[PDB]
Design a protein around this ligand. Structure first.
Ligand SMILES: *[C@@H]1O[C@H](CO)[C@@H](O[C@@H]2O[C@H](CO)[C@@H](O)[C@H](O)[C@H]2NC(C)=O)[C@H](O)[C@H]1NC(C)=O
Ligand SMILES: *[C@@H]1O[C@H](CO)[C@@H](O[C@@H]2O[C@H](CO)[C@@H](O)[C@H](O)[C@H]2NC(C)=O)[C@H](O)[C@H]1NC(C)=O
Ligand SMILES: *[C@@H]1O[C@H](CO)[C@@H](O[C@@H]2O[C@H](CO)[C@@H](O)[C@H](O)[C@H]2NC(C)=O)[C@H](O)[C@H]1NC(C)=O
Ligand SMILES: *[C@@H]1O[C@H](CO)[C@@H](O)[C@H](O)[C@H]1NC(C)=O
Ligand SMILES: *[C@@H]1O[C@H](CO)[C@@H](O)[C@H](O)[C@H]1NC(C)=O
Ligand SMILES: *[C@@H]1O[C@H](CO)[C@@H](O)[C@H](O)[C@H]1NC(C)=O
Ligand SMILES: *[C@@H]1O[C@H](CO)[C@@H](O)[C@H](O)[C@H]1NC(C)=O
Ligand SMILES: *[C@@H]1O[C@H](CO)[C@@H](O)[C@H](O)[C@H]1NC(C)=O
Ligand SMILES: *[C@@H]1O[C@H](CO)[C@@H](O)[C@H](O)[C@H]1NC(C)=O
Ligand SMILES: *[C@@H]1O[C@H](CO)[C@@H](O)[C@H](O)[C@H]1NC(C)=O
Ligand SMILES: *[C@@H]1O[C@H](CO)[C@@H](O)[C@H](O)[C@H]1NC(C)=O
Ligand SMILES: *[C@@H]1O[C@H](CO)[C@@H](O)[C@H](O)[C@H]1NC(C)=O
Ligand SMILES: *[C@@H]1O[C@H](CO)[C@@H](O)[C@H](O)[C@H]1NC(C)=O
Ligand SMILES: *[C@@H]1O[C@H](CO)[C@@H](O)[C@H](O)[C@H]1NC(C)=O
Ligand SMILES: *[C@@H]1O[C@H](CO)[C@@H](O)[C@H](O)[C@H]1NC(C)=O
Lengths: 21, 833
């Protein structure tokens, strides 16, 4: 299905820190 | 003629009993009354327009459509139709609208469509059409709209498509078209929106596109165009939108683009652009979105910034290698909703003026070098939803004013130097979904107010200095996926209200001072994925944690957990790592671990487990590490351990294992540590142990082994520690031992029954730091190479039956190294009488 023809630029969403597990 | 044709394709567009076109039967014979059809308004009958969209049709399009020489609008859009587009629509020269979009159509676009020169709008996209775009499309000079997007079309944009002088919208995005963009489209001069995004254009952007005075939209994002951006595109003065993101563009950003007075969004992120941000951009009043992230730009924010940016809503300059401090001048962009300066090399403090930006919803300052304090002025940004400051060197207390931010959703402060209490009013930020403060120096209690945060799905306070209890109020944060309070100074019990976190997947509480029983309510946590309670003072049974299946890693090392290991741990087929070491667990190892196909590391050391190793663990073919030290395990070393081809470390020491070593075990060619000391293993040592060519550590101490020592042990070229002490070995030490050149940490043969000479070849052990042969029955003189040993630090040969004058290499070894040998005299001992 069809995509927007000129979308408004959206921010990246940055991560929470984790590596312990 | 035409009322035959109308009922004709209802046969091909609906091969079924059920007709959305039920009205199309010869029984109601005036076809103009029918659903979806429109006949001429002039009384000559005949069909001018057909509108069938949203009907849900699943059939095919047929060549009988072409028979209508009076059709002007054909709309079959937004169904589920199948098959090719008939080239027979060649014949409908009267057509002015052709809408086939959002079906499932196949094939190439018919060459013969070029003969429909009286067509005005053509929309055939959102299909699975597969061919190259036919060059005949340039014939359609009357065309105002052309949409070929979201299909599977290939090849270059036809350059003899510049003949379409009057097209207003040209839509080609989401295909596989390739090659250069033609200069010839400069001649399409009423063009106003042009998108070829999400394709494979591999040329450079032609400068001839400045020609298009009326172009308002340009979108070539997500392509692979190269070269420099033509400064001629500044001439496109009606432009409002430009995006060239996600290409391979090079060069300095052109300074002309400030000449586009009507420009509302400029996006050139994710290219190889360089140079500084032209200061002309700061005079662009009408701009809303400037995003230039992830370009190898250079320089720093000049104090010219926001000089005339009155309308600007979103400024994104992350990953642009910017330097310097944040300008106080940036608070002139009073309209700004989203500021992103992250992933740069910015320094200094956060300017107090930046909390003049009262319309901000998102503030991104993370992964810079910023120092200073977080101002209590943060309350003024009352609309803020994401505040992201991690990986800076901010310090000080955290403002109690942070509690005025009732719309705040994400609070990322991790990897700073913040200090002091978390604000007791933090629960006022009811919207919060994620809080991460890891790595700071926060102190005092965790706010009970946090239990107000119903939306909270992540809470991460790890590596701080927090003290006091876990607040029962947190049991009210029902949407928590990850709760991580590890590496703190927390005390008291886990509250039974945590049983209310029914959706929690990760629970990390390790390295604290938590105490007492787990509450029975934790059985309700059946979605748990990773738990780590290690290094606490919890007691009672671990049964309440096995209400979940689907564990991946389960760690409780170093606690005071009692009773039997739950067989229910077998429920987690995907459990990679199981650690129950250093507890007070009892009973046998559970057989059901054989269900854990994915088990790789098993640790149950320093408990009070009894019985034997269950046969069923042979099912855990992925096991690389077994650690069962310091339990009360019994019976033989089970030969099925040889089926664990991946086993790298097997630790079975300080148990009560009781018989001979199985030959099977040496099929574990990947073993690097095999320590079986402190058991009661008996019998000889097998020749096939040399099969362990990768072995680094062998420790058979404090067993009761027998017999002579195999010549094959010289095969373990990578072994750096060898311990066989406090056994009853009987032979003479083999000359083959000198081949163990990598021995370093110890060669311990003490408290056995070895006889004969010490082999001269031991002095060949270049890197060995400690050699102990005490308490044997060895004979003769010590070969002197043994005293010269380059790396040797400890030597003891006491309580043997050696003799003679010690070769003069043995000076400044102590007398204690040669004790108990009657008949031995020399440099460190008494003179030879
Ligand atoms: C800043 O840099 C980081 C790391 O280079 C980027 O973080 C990635 O973000 C995406 C989207 O959230 C995640 O899928 C990745 O896991 C993150 N880490 C990595 C190593 O890729 C981030 O995109 C950059 N930009 C911003 C605004 O944070
Ligand atoms: C841009 O794409 C076209 C098409 O893929 C490439 O043109 C090919 O060039 C090679 C020689 O390098 C010829 O042998 C082929 O016949 C051409 N056509 C095809 C379809 O492969 C062109 O090389 C690409 N340019 C860049 C810079 O990547
Ligand atoms: C901080 O930002 C820098 C620069 O954005 C990151 O370093 C590079 O990140 C990119 C992803 O944007 C990688 O492709 C590079 O390999 C990284 N190194 C270099 C030398 O460019 C860094 O990862 C970020 N760190 C954190 C903690 O987010
Ligand atoms: C067909 O009908 C829909 C509404 O059902 C309308 O939006 C559309 O413009 C009509 N005509 C054409 C040619 O699409
Ligand atoms: C069409 O484009 C070419 C490109 O070189 C240009 O020379 C020509 O003037 C254009 N056509 C007209 C009628 O101007
Ligand atoms: C570009 O690529 C991203 C990621 O694939 C996508 O989300 C976006 O919609 C694409 N198009 C534009 C115009 O950003
Ligand atoms: C900002 O730019 C706009 C462009 O239309 C202009 O009207 C306005 O006078 C400019 N203001 C300043 C201070 O440059
Ligand atoms: C924020 O609001 C306070 C009022 O409580 C005001 O004193 C302050 O000046 C405002 N912001 C800045 C950046 O000064
Ligand atoms: C926070 O919530 C409490 C309880 O409703 C209220 O008394 C207080 O005024 C609120 N705002 C601040 C800034 O503390
Ligand atoms: C557990 O996880 C599954 C899959 O992610 C989800 O459908 C289910 O609702 C979750 N249960 C709870 C109580 O959160
Ligand atoms: C904390 O975790 C570290 C991780 O290396 C561990 O060595 C230590 O024993 C734990 N306990 C304390 C009190 O540091
Ligand atoms: C478990 O810890 C609690 C903490 O107060 C203590 O009272 C109890 O005696 C402990 N039980 C065992 C078996 O260690
Ligand atoms: C000890 O070894 C002998 C043979 O070496 C074997 O017959 C015996 O069963 C083993 N165990 C005990 C308890 O004697
Ligand atoms: C082995 O060494 C021990 C040392 O305590 C000794 O008592 C025992 O007699 C020795 N056995 C033989 C066969 O020499
Ligand atoms: C060597 O071992 C004996 C006991 O076997 C001990 O008395 C002596 O001190 C040891 N010498 C050194 C230097 O450690």
């Amino acid at each position: 299905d069809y995509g927007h023809s000129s979308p408004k630029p959206k921010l990246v969403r940055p991560p929470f820190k984790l590596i312990p597990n | 003629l035409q009322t035959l044709l109308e009922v004709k394709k209802s046969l091909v567009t609906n091969p079924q009993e059920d007709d959305p076109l039920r009205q199309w039967n010869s029984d109601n014979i005036n076809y103009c009354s029918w659903t979806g059809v429109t006949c001429d308004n002039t009384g000559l009958f005949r069909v001018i327009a057909l509108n069938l969209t949203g009907l849900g049709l699943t059939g095919s399009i047929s060549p009988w459509f072409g028979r209508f020489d009076n059709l002007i609008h054909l709309d079959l859009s937004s169904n589920n139709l199948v098959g090719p587009i008939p080239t027979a629509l060649s014949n409908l020269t009267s057509l002015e609208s052709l809408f086939l979009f959002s079906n499932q159509l196949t094939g190439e676009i018919p060459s013969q469509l070029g003969s429909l020169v009286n067509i005005r709008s053509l929309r055939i996209g959102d299909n699975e059409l597969v061919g190259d775009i036919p060059e005949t499309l340039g014939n359609l000079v009357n065309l105002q709209m052309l949409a070929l997007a979201s299909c599977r079309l290939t090849g270059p944009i036809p350059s003899q498509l510049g003949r379409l002088v009057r097209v207003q919208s040209l839509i080609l995005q989401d295909n596989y078209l390739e090659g250069p963009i033609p200069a010839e489209l400069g001649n399409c001069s009423d063009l106003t929106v042009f998108t070829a995004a999400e394709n494979m254009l591999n040329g450079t952007i032609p400068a001839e596109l400045g020609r298009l005075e009326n172009l308002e939209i340009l979108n070539l994002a997500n392509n692979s165009l190269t070269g420099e951006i033509p400064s001629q595109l500044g001439e496109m003065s009606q432009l409002q939108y430009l995006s060239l993101m996600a290409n391979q563009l090079q060069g300095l950003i052109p300074k002309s683009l400030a000449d586009l007075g009507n420009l509302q969004t400029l996006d050139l992120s994710a290219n190889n652009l360089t140079g500084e941000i032209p200061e002309e951009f700061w005079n662009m009043s009408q701009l809303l979105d400037l995003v230039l992230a992830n370009n190898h730009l250079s320089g720093s924010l000049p104090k010219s910034i926001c000089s005339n940016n009155t309308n600007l809503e979103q400024l994104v300059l992350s990953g642009t290698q910017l330097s310097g401090e944040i300008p106080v001048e940036l608070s002139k962009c009073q309209s700004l909703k989203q500021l992103d300066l992250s992933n740069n090399s910015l320094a200094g403090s956060i300017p107090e003026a930046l909390f003049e930006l009262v319309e901000l919803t998102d503030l991104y300052l993370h992964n810079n070098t910023l120092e200073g304090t977080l101002s209590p002025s943060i309350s003024n940004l009352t609309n803020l939803q994401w505040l992201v400051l991690y990986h800076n060197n901010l310090e000080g207390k955290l403002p109690k004013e942070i509690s005025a931010l009732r719309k705040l959703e994400v609070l990322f402060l991790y990897e700073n130097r913040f200090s002091g209490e978390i604000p007791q009013e933090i629960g006022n930020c009811t919207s919060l979904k994620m809080i991460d403060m890891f790595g700071n120096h926060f102190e005092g209690e965790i706010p009970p107010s946090i239990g107000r945060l119903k939306e909270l799905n992540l809470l991460h306070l790890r590596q701080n200095e927090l003290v006091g209890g876990l607040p029962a109020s947190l049991g009210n944060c029902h949407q928590l996926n990850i709760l991580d309070l590890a590496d703190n100074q927390l005390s008291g019990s886990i509250p039974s209200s945590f049983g209310f976190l029914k959706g929690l997947e990760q629970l990390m509480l390790y390295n604290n001072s938590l105490q007492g029983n787990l509450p029975d309510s934790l059985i309700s946590l059946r979605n748990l994925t990773r738990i780590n309670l290690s290094h606490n003072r919890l007691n009672g049974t671990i049964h309440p944690l096995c209400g979940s299946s689907s564990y991946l890693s389960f760690d409780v090392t170093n606690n005071g957990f009692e009773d039997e290991i739950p067989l229910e741990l077998g429920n987690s087929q995907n459990l990679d790592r199981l650690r129950l070491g250093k507890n007070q667990l009892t009973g046998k190892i559970p057989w059901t671990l054989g269900k854990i196909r994915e088990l790789s590391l098993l640790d149950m050391s320093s408990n009070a487990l009894t019985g034997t190793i269950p046969l069923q663990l042979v099912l855990c073919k992925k096991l690389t590490h077994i650690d069962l030290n310091n339990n009360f395990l019994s019976g033989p070393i089970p030969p099925w351990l040889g089926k664990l081809s991946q086993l790298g470390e097997l630790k079975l020491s300080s148990n009560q294992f009781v018989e001979s070593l199985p030959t099977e075990l040496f099929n574990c060619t990947k073993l690097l540590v095999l320590s079986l000391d402190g058991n009661s293993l008996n019998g000889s040592i097998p020749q096939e142990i040399g099969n362990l060519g990768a072995l680094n550590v062998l420790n058979l101490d404090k067993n009761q082994f027998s017999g002579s020592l195999p010549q094959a042990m010289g095969k373990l070229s990578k072994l750096y520690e060898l311990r066989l002490s406090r056994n009853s070995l009987t032979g003479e030490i083999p000359v083959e031992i000198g081949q163990l050149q990598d021995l370093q940490s110890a060669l311990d043969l003490s408290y056995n029954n070895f006889t004969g000479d010490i082999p001269s070849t031991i002095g060949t052990l270049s890197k060995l730091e400690t050699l102990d042969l005490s308490h044997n029955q060895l004979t003769g003189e010590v070969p002197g190479s043994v005293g010269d040993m380059k790396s040797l630090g400890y030597l003891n040969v006491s309580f043997n039956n050696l003799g003679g004058k010690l070769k003069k290499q043995f000076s400044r070894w102590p007398a204690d190294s040669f004790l108990g040998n009657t008949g031995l005299c020399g440099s460190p001992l008494s003179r030879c009488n």
